[PDB]
Amino acid sequence: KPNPLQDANLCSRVFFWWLNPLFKIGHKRRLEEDDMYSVLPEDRSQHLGEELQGFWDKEVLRAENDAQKPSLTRAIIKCYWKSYLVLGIFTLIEESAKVIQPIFLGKIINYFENYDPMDSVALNTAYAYATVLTFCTLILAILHHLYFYHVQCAGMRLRVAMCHMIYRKALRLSNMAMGKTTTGQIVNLLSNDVNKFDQVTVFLHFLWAGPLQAIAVTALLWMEIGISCLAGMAVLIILLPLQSCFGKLFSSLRSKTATFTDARIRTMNEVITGIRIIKMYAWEKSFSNLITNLRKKEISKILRSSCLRGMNLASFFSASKIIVFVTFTTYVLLGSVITASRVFVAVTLYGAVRLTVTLFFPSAIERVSEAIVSIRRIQTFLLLDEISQRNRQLPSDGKKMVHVQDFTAFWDKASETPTLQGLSFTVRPGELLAVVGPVGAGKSSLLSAVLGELAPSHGLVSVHGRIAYVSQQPWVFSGTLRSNILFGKKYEKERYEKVIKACALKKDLQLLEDGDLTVIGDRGTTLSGGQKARVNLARAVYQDADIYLLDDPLSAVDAEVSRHLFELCICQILHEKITILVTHQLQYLKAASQILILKDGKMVQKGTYTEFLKSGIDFGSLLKKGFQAYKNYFRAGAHWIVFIFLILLNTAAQVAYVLQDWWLSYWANKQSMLNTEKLDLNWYLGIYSGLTVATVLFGIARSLLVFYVLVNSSQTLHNKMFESILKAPVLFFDRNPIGRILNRFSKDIGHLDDLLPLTFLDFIQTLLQVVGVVSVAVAVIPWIAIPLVPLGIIFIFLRRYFLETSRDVKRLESTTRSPVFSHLSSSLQGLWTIRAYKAEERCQELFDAHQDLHSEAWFLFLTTSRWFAVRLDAICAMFVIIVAFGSLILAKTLDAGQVGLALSYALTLMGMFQWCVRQSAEVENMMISVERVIEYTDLEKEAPWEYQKRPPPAWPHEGVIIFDNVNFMYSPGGPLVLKHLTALIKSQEKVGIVGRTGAGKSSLISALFRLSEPEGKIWIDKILTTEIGLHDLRKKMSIIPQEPVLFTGTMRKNLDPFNEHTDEELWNALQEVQLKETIEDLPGKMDTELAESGSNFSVGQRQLVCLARAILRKNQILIIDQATANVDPRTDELIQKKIREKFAHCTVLTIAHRLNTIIDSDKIMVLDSGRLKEYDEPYVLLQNKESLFYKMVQQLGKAEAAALTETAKQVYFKRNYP
Ligand SMILES: CS(=O)(=O)CCNCc1ccc(-c2ccc3ncnc(Nc4ccc(OCc5cccc(F)c5)c(Cl)c4)c3c2)o1
Ligand SMILES: Nc1ncnc2c1ncn2[C@@H]1O[C@H](COP(=O)(O)OP(=O)(O)OP(=O)(O)O)[C@@H](O)[C@H]1O
Ligand SMILES: Nc1ncnc2c1ncn2[C@@H]1O[C@H](COP(=O)(O)OP(=O)(O)OP(=O)(O)O)[C@@H](O)[C@H]1O
Ligand SMILES: [Mg+2]
Ligand SMILES: [Mg+2]
């Protein structure tokens, strides 16, 4: 894939003529990672990184010699200034041309003021001036794009070199350095700190060419107009602090909103995650109250910030008019006269200097400050401490030997007890050493000292030969399983097959689609813990080392696989290699030649397994311790009459803007046509002031109305969408993930509230200004309407052609960016394993390859943008040339004022055209959020909360339950769960639910709660459930779920969202559940805040709270789940006795994944794959051996089965025969 930029001329490199094949391919089909162009050798990551590293090392050596801190800024300056001279040269030329061209504009107008048809030398001079103007515009329009591309490429090169240097440092941190630093800070500084280097360079040169341009413009204005230019210059200067101060308030009003936004998002997350609970207990009204209040509070600050932004944009719109008006008011009031030559040069000079002073200089200042901060951060990181390089080893005979003597290290220098106390032992090839003792107190520290991971404070460690190390926690790096096993070294088929067979990885390969070539990312999402541990072992074996180190290799795998591995892959293969093993299982100590015991880092006893057996010490004992989108977006804001009024306001603002300059032209013509007599100053100045005031007011009004209307549309959309999602059936929440649901509330509404209206208003502003420029040009010279049609057609086709590939490249440079961060993070996590083997240059090369692959797409991202901009500027320059030459061709009709107005507007079209196109693309891109929000606004809905037939307030008066031909399915058309359930449940009786796992257990509860619409009839108190509203059905029957959830809020809110109970009743419930004492000790009495999901409360406390809530509700029908699985048996007995003694007079159903505690129920419902088999007294079912209940009881055993039978018999005798 050769780079076409390597074989390009200059007339092809200034027009970007080599990108045509790529654009053609992108138009024909979609582009992939094969289609991108490989980078040039001078842009490879290794070269740039090595260059900057050499310069930085020279600088740090010089600073060390000088006894002073180093300077990354000095290093980058000394590396890049000699290549940044040339771009400064060209930007100087460009600024000179920008300042120069209005002088020739003035010369053309000056010719036109004294038109004489008979003269021809004047016509020739005017043609020459027009040609010079065309040359200046072509310089501004064509070469500037190659200059800009090189300016951007310089920053990209700096960033790539920085990334290489940062990772090279990251691969060699020391232990304390890794401890003090964090795995998140490094990726933070590689994702949000080294990305300011793409933007510091683009606006870098405008720190010295800004004031120079302002000085040149002020001198030119003084030369032409006179003292009056200081009024315009003063307004332009005053515009700087005002704009700066209009940002320090927006920052405050934007950081005030984030609190409400985050609170709303967190509450939304709670609602979405615990949706089943809210729907079951009917708390959606309270949750809607909370969410609505938060949304209103946030929208207040959004409205304030939007009004501020609108006022700022109106100021930007009207600043030029204010400057021109005040300048010329002073110019005329000082006793001078107006001629069309000077006014329309002052206008152009003011436009240029105002743009530069308003935008580019503050942008450059901000970007330079941010880049300075980022350089400081990267320098502070780079100055971290590292390990000392492995020095020249002691001269030995080359034998593979392991020895440690008098070792004593310190993980923390401020700690008291050293990690190791005077260890002294050696091991040789063919010997298997083992280490046992406590639950792991200083277990891996021996391996750390052996590998050099621990700094030896005293003693000596002699290790010779290749080493293989297995981490306690297995680590897998992003790539492929084959590449993970290879670890960068060569691949041999026979060796790989032998390792795979000896590692029992055949089944693991079979379970994967690609076998040994499966692509595995971070954290082993496509694998399992045992598989990645086996991967680690396979890596260690395949590395073919001399010394082998193991640490907890078989704790995360099963028994047979672990035994087979430890036998075949160790006792046979490694019998000729040094081995040191740390294990927790004593069954592997039989094959261990040597066994050592360590307690608290102290040498205790070492020897053979037989000797330790004779010693009488037990190791086990020692181990104990489109368009409709736009229509719907606009309609929700306000009616169509406001749309008409907005159109009128836009047109009035633009018309007044243009009419001010037209009035200046009219004044100039009227003054020129004269004779002393004097023009009436009052009339002209009054009309001028009126037009200026109209421009300002209409601009402000248009901005405010657009902002308010779009913000109101966003608010209405959000309210409708939240009310729609709150009523969706649980099938929707089952089909969608929680993150996806919360995304459309966090990011999409985040766009709609604060970015879409501003982008839309800016686009409308610029489009109207372009339309005004073209309209003035057409009105002055009516024949310009002929080529504008070809220009528009060409522009439309060009926009389609470019955007058919720009979006593809924008996604290509984004899907190839994240692997850099992924590799950095993964290599940081597995740093110890990586450094254990001598293979770190391999990881460095892989990282550099990834960085090259990303620069491969960044290059396309730059060059395609330049390719589009070149053609756009060619079109705009063609328009300017047409105007400037037609004005001279048709000179027999026009006059000085008209020509000056047309020419000045044609000159100002520069830059404005491109900004309009870019903003249109941005708006079209951002409308997808509106599309998604509107899509969520029209979701499904469930049955109405309230029905026409309101129930009498005695509906659960007795508690009769009838199931008649009840069939339930979670999804329409899916497999059936219940088949013809027919049963009757009487009042006050306790009914238990039993069955096998997956046999439709937790389905009758959902059928009773009408979570999904059932098939059949269910009668409660001789009333059908489907004839009553859901809020009249779910409200007054209670359920205790598997795991209770506590929502963030007061305890009063948690136990009574509707505030239907008083303080005395709440305290009575708390003391009846024995939680009153536990509650009345917080700083708050009973309104203390709670963490998410009760993070500070125990599971028993959650069940206690649920029981208290049920008692407070006081429902006649109650259904409990298994509740307890691992809770303290004391708490289990407490809740059992409370359930027995509190709900005697209320119907109780008991579903459970449990036993014995469900033995006292009056009747047992037996479910076989959703079929109701047995429904009768437990004793009667136990009497028959063929009954499934008896077999399920016998599945436990014989003593427990006998106890259960006795309990059932006693319950039957006491109940049925009192
Ligand atoms: C009456 S006026 O002086 O305002 C007319 C000219 N400006 C019109 C206008 C309205 C809004 C903007 C605008 C808003 C935001 C922007 N953000 C970035 N860059 C902008 N423009 C810009 C213009 C010229 C530049 O110099 C290089 C150049 C030279 C010739 C042609 C080009 F396309 C570019 C640069 Cl670097 C940026 C901008 C404008 O411009
Ligand atoms: N990754 C680590 N970073 C810093 N200190 C560590 C690390 N691993 C162990 N240590 C320290 O080494 C010493 C060994 O004690 P500890 O019992 O925690 O070791 P271990 O080998 O990780 O334990 P176990 O075998 O139970 O997993 C302690 O002082 C501990 O803080
Ligand atoms: N939300 C659901 N959507 C689709 N199928 C489901 C859903 N919940 C359960 N199932 C399926 O329905 C069958 C039985 O469901 P159920 O949850 O009642 O079984 P269980 O394991 O006996 O009960 P428990 O939830 O008490 O463990 C199983 O095949 C299960 O996979
Ligand atoms: Mg350990
Ligand atoms: Mg289940």
First vs last C-alpha separation in the chain: 94
Residue 439 labelled as part of a binding site: yes
Pairing of strands 1171-1176, 1163-1168: antiparallel
Quick one: which ligand is closest to 1154's CA? 3
Closest Cα partner for 821 from 327, 323, 188?
188
C-alpha to C-alpha distances, 499 to 56, 465, 493, 503, 833, nearest whole angstrom: 45, 21, 10, 6, 19
CB-based burial label for 339 (10 Å; 0-12, 13-18, 19+): middle
Total length of the chain:
1218
Tokens representing residue 72 in the block: 């990354």
Distance CA 1200, CA 1159 (A): 12
Ligand 3 atom, smallest distance to 1002 CA: 18
Residue 440 labelled as part of a binding site: yes
Closest Cα partner for 539 from 298, 834, 289?
834
3-state secondary structure of 55: helix
Residue 1120: partners with Cβ closer than 8 Å, 6 or more residues away: 1039, 1040, 1139, 1148, 1149, 1150, 1151, 1152
Beginning with the edge strand found earlier in the chain, give each strand of the sheet holding 1147-1151 in spatial order: 1038-1040, 1117-1120, 1147-1151, 990-995, 1163-1168, 1171-1176
DSSP at 1014: -
Documented resolution in Å: 3.3
Distance CA 471, CA 165 (A): 27
> E strands within 306-385?
none
Distance CA 438, CA 620 (A): 10
Q: Residue 948: phi, psi to the nearest 5? A: -65, -40
DSSP at 215: H
Q: Where in the chain is the domain with CATH 3.40.50.300?
A: 402-622
Contact (Cβ atoms closer than 8 angstroms) between residue 745 and residue 268: yes
- Residue holding tokens 């093993």? 581
327 lines ligand 1 (CB under 6 A): no
C-alpha to C-alpha distances, 1184 to 1165, 1176, 1189, nearest whole angstrom: 16, 12, 9
Q: How far is the CA of 978 from the centre of ligand 5 (A)?
A: 13
Closest Cα partner for 126 from 1179, 1039, 886, 829?
886
Closest Cα partner for 763 from 630, 605, 617, 905?
630
Beginning with the edge strand found earlier in the chain, give each strand of the sheet holding 578-582 in spatial order: 467-469, 547-551, 578-582, 432-436, 594-599, 602-607
Q: How far is the CA of 1039 from the centre of ligand 5 (A)?
A: 16
Distance CA 424, CA 415 (A): 22
Q: Residue 980: phi, psi to the nearest 5? A: 55, 65
Q: How many CB atoms lie within 10 A of CB 223?
A: 10
Ligand 3 atom, smallest distance to 996 CA: 22
DSSP-derived secondary structure for 67-114: TS---HHHHHHHHHHHHHHHHHHHHHHHHHHHHHHHHHHHHHHHHHHT
3-state secondary structure of 482: helix
Distance CA 349, CA 352 (A): 5
Closest Cα partner for 307 from 605, 707, 729, 614?
707
Mutation pick for ligand 2 pocket among 417, 444, 600 (CB with most ligand atoms within 8 Å): 444
Encode 855-919 in three state secondary structure. Answer: HHHHHHHHHHHHHHHHHHHHHHHHHHHHHHHHHHHCCCCCCHHHHHHHHHHHHHHHHHHHHHHHH
873 lines ligand 1 (CB under 6 A): yes
Q: Residue 1149: phi, psi to the nearest 5? A: -115, 145
- Residue holding tokens 């359920």? 1039
Contact (Cβ atoms closer than 8 angstroms) between residue 1182 and residue 1112: no
The torsion defined by the Cα of 1182, 1183, 1186 and 1187, in degrees rounded to 10, comes to -40
Fill in the amino acid letter for 887: S
3-state secondary structure of 173: strand
Note the CATH architecture for domain 402-622. Answer: 3-Layer(aba) Sandwich (3.40)
DSSP-derived secondary structure for 1149-1200: EEE-S--GGGSS-SEEEEEETTEEEEEE-HHHHHH-SSSHHHHHHHHH-SHH
Contact (Cβ atoms closer than 8 angstroms) between residue 506 and residue 513: no
Kind and range of the H or E element at 407?
strand 402-408
Residue 798: partners with Cβ closer than 8 Å, 6 or more residues away: 868, 871, 872, 875
Contact (Cβ atoms closer than 8 angstroms) between residue 751 and residue 929: yes
How many CA atoms are closer than 13 Å to the CA of 200, on its beta-carbon side? 20
3-state secondary structure of 404: strand
Residue 884 labelled as part of a binding site: no
Distance CA 444, CA 551 (A): 7
Fill in the amino acid letter for 1002: S
- Residue holding tokens 């027919």? 982
Distance CA 305, CA 249 (A): 9
Distance CA 970, CA 1000 (A): 11
Q: How many CB atoms lie within 10 A of CB 625?
A: 8
Q: Which residues are paired to 520 by β-bridges?
A: 479
Distance CA 352, CA 958 (A): 87
- Residue holding tokens 């016998």? 1194
Distance CA 927, CA 793 (A): 25
Q: How far is the CA of 419 from the centre of ligand 2 (A)?
A: 9
Closest Cα partner for 37 from 813, 800, 807?
813
Contact (Cβ atoms closer than 8 angstroms) between residue 661 and residue 741: no
Q: Which residues surround ligand 4, an ion (CB under 5 A)?
A: 440, 443-444
Distance CA 713, CA 1011 (A): 34
Pairing of strands 467-469, 547-551: parallel
Beginning with the edge strand found earlier in the chain, give each strand of the sheet holding 1015-1020 in spatial order: 981-985, 961-967, 1015-1020, 1023-1024
Fill in the amino acid letter for 398: G
User: Which residue has the least CA distance to atom 24 on ligand 1?
Assistant: 911
Q: How many CB atoms lie within 10 A of CB 268?
A: 19
User: Which residue has the least CA distance to atom 23 on ligand 2?
Assistant: 440
Ligand 3 atom, smallest distance to 999 CA: 22
Give the pocket of ligand 3 (CB within 6 Å). 734, 970, 977, 997-1003, 1153
C-alpha to C-alpha distances, 1109 to 366, 1057, 1084, nearest whole angstrom: 57, 10, 20
Closest Cα partner for 191 from 211, 218, 167, 169?
167
Contact (Cβ atoms closer than 8 angstroms) between residue 964 and residue 789: no
Distance CA 1091, CA 1048 (A): 6
139 lines ligand 1 (CB under 6 A): no
DSSP-derived secondary structure for 541-605: HHT--SEEEEES-SSSS-HHHHHHHIIIIIIITGGGSEEEEE-S-GGGSTT-SEEEEEETTEEEE
How many CA atoms are closer than 13 Å to the CA of 1079, on its beta-carbon side? 26
Angle at 670 between CA 669 and CA 672, to 5 degrees: 65
User: Which residue has the least CA distance to atom 17 on ligand 2?
Assistant: 441
Residue 974 labelled as part of a binding site: no
Ligand 1 atom, smallest distance to 869 CA: 33
Q: How far is the CA of 970 from the centre of ligand 3 (A)?
A: 9
DSSP at 1126: S
Kind and range of the H or E element at 175?
helix 175-180
3-state secondary structure of 666: helix
Distance CA 680, CA 669 (A): 14
Contact (Cβ atoms closer than 8 angstroms) between residue 298 and residue 714: no
User: Where is the chain broken, named by the residue before each break, C–N > 2.5 Å?
Assistant: 625, 675
User: Which residue has the least CA distance to atom 19 on ligand 3?
Assistant: 998
Angle at 831 between CA 828 and CA 835, to 5 degrees: 150
DSSP at 1094: G
Q: State the chain's maximal CA–CA distance in angstroms.
A: 135
Pairing of strands 1117-1120, 981-985: unpaired
Helices (H), 334-360: 340-355
Distance CA 549, CA 402 (A): 11
Contact (Cβ atoms closer than 8 angstroms) between residue 130 and residue 885: yes
Distance CA 6, CA 27 (A): 24
